[PDB]
Ligand binder design. Structure first.
Ligand SMILES: [Zn+2]
Length: 215
């Protein structure tokens, strides 16, 4: 069930009744749209303000609810870039202290800096855990786990089967990245779906692939 927009720059496909993947072309980039009884929650917004506004608008219209919350999985420009849109619309931008600090040092508005190593949120019916597994793609990268669905948003930490190399490593810790992958494999032993930061949804195999790419 792939709903694209006006332009096809934004697309959403359903993973289940309440969880969709959003993907914007910037190189496609994924995140989640969580349809909760209390509003839309995004795991990651988009590359910039323009596409973040377009994304919010597309899902608010489709789901007939407001985006109330976004979880930012690391501070890179393509993750933090819509921060200005979120803050001005009163959309709560969740992040680790570290992501927020990085965002601020890179001259972005700051997300909330409210996530710890392990944080458990609940949005209406929808339980969301964020997990900081260690450094990898960046210093600050976190994964998000939907325990009612065993769905893992790996974000840029996790490479799609299509990714044949590590992508941008300028800010990466390619030695700690394996450990961090392992920390994810240990915390979540039973995974139905993983969402890589780019590319197609997979399973546990994506993290095994990412492990391989680090060899
Ligand atoms: Zn990044």
């Amino acid at each position: 069930t792939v709903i694209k927009n006006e332009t096809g720059t934004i697309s959403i496909s359903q993973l289940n009744k309440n969880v969709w993947v959003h993907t914007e072309l910037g190189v496609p980039s994924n995140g989640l749209v969580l349809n909760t009884s209390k509003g839309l929650v995004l795991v990651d917004s988009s590359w910039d303000d323009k596409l973040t506004k377009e994304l919010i608008e597309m899902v608010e219209k489709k789901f007939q609810k407001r985006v109330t919350d976004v979880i930012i999985t690391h501070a890179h420009a393509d993750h933090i870039g819509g921060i200005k849109t979120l803050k001005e619309r009163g959309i709560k931008a969740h992040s680790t202290a570290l992501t927020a600090e990085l965002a601020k040092k890179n001259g972005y508005e700051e997300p909330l800096g409210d996530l710890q190593t392990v944080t458990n949120l609940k949005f209406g019916n929808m339980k969301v855990e964020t997990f900081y597994p260690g450094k990898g793609h960046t210093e600050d990268n976190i994964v998000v786990w939907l325990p009612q669905y065993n769905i893992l948003v790996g974000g840029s930490l996790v490479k799609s089967t299509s990714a044949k190399d590590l992508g941008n490593v300028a800010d990466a810790y390619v030695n700690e990245w394996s450990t961090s992958i392992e920390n994810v494999l240990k915390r979540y032993r039973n995974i139905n779906a993983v969402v890589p930061g780019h590319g197609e949804v997979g399973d546990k195999g994506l993290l095994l692939h990412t492990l391989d790419l680090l060899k």
